[PDB]
Amino acid sequence: IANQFNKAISQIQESLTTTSTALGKLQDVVNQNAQALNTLVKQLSSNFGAISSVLNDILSRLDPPEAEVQIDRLITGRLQSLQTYVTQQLIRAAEIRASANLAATKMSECVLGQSKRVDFCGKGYHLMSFPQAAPHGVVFLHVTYVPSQERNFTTAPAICHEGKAYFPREGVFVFNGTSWFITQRNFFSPQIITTDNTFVSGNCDVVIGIINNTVYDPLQPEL
């Protein structure tokens, strides 16, 4: 476990040294901000239907009456441009605000505790996570448990012993090369089926798929 952990970290370190997409999300936000700013300012050169985009080029050659009219046209234009910007800014803010709320939630559930909900802290089974500082954002390293290569075994809903139906506890009845055992679904460790690792309820004639088997009871070697 420790070995894989250490290597996984090294693998990420290398990945983040040669890739170009890992922080695309952060760069995107920055790019959008730059575009919005340049758009607003650029419009200062817009004519907006005026005789000139420049106030000096209006006043310098027009009597105050007509000059004021042309200026007023210019002003109206520029005001609409700034209003447009701020509206868009609020919309952008709303999306980020939502992201921040999520990020706060993820730290709380993935870092400061251990998530039970699936596909929240990662695809595998959540074990651990660590925050890392990042420009205009947060980077998380999520450590998960992932099941590996499987094996085929035969199973059984219950086993019949001394005329009674025995049911498994947290594990499942599993059949290997001519021997029955009980083990947890998420791993493989074939335990002996014993009286204190099971329970009995109902007879064997009320169970579908029930098979004949035995249950160990320490009473016998003790007595």
Ligand X SMILES: *[C@@H]1O[C@H](CO)[C@@H](O[C@@H]2O[C@H](CO)[C@@H](O[C@@H]3O[C@H](CO)[C@@H](O)[C@H](O[C@H]4O[C@H](CO)[C@@H](O)[C@H](O)[C@@H]4O)[C@@H]3O)[C@H](O)[C@H]2NC(C)=O)[C@H](O)[C@H]1NC(C)=O
Ligand Y SMILES: *[C@@H]1O[C@H](CO)[C@@H](O[C@@H]2O[C@H](CO)[C@@H](O[C@@H]3O[C@H](CO[C@H]4O[C@H](CO)[C@@H](O)[C@H](O)[C@@H]4O)[C@@H](O)[C@H](O[C@H]4O[C@H](CO)[C@@H](O)[C@H](O)[C@@H]4O)[C@@H]3O)[C@H](O)[C@H]2NC(C)=O)[C@H](O)[C@H]1NC(C)=O
Ligand Z SMILES: *[C@@H]1O[C@H](CO)[C@@H](O[C@@H]2O[C@H](CO)[C@@H](O[C@@H]3O[C@H](CO)[C@@H](O)[C@H](O)[C@@H]3O)[C@H](O)[C@H]2NC(C)=O)[C@H](O)[C@H]1NC(C)=O
Footprint on residues 124-163 left by ligand Y (CB under 6 A):
150-152, 160
Helix (H) or strand (E) holding 109: none
Tokens 């009871």 belong to 217
Residue (20 or 212) nearer to ligand Y, CB:
212
Q: Specify the residue, 110 or 160, whose C-beta has the smaller distance to ligand Y.
A: 160
SS (H, E, C) 15-39: HHHHCCCCCHHHHHHHHHHHHHHHH
Residue 4 CB, shortest distance to ligand Z, in Å, is 7
Collect all residues with Cβ–Cβ distance below 8 Å to 23 and sequence separation of at least 6: 134, 137, 139
- Contact between 172 and 185 under an 8 Å Cβ cutoff? The reply is yes
Check binding of 49 to other proteins (CB under 8 A).
yes
Q: How far is the CB of 3 from ligand Z (least distance, A)?
A: 6
- Chain residues 89-148 in contact with other proteins, contact rule CB under 8 A: 91, 94-96, 98-99, 102-103, 106, 116-120, 122-125, 127, 134, 136-148
Binding mask 161-200 for ligand Y (x = CB under 6 A): ----------------------------------------
> Which pair of tokens denotes residue 161?
């012993």
The token pair that represents 208 in the structure block: 């579908």
220 binds other proteins (CB under 8 A): no
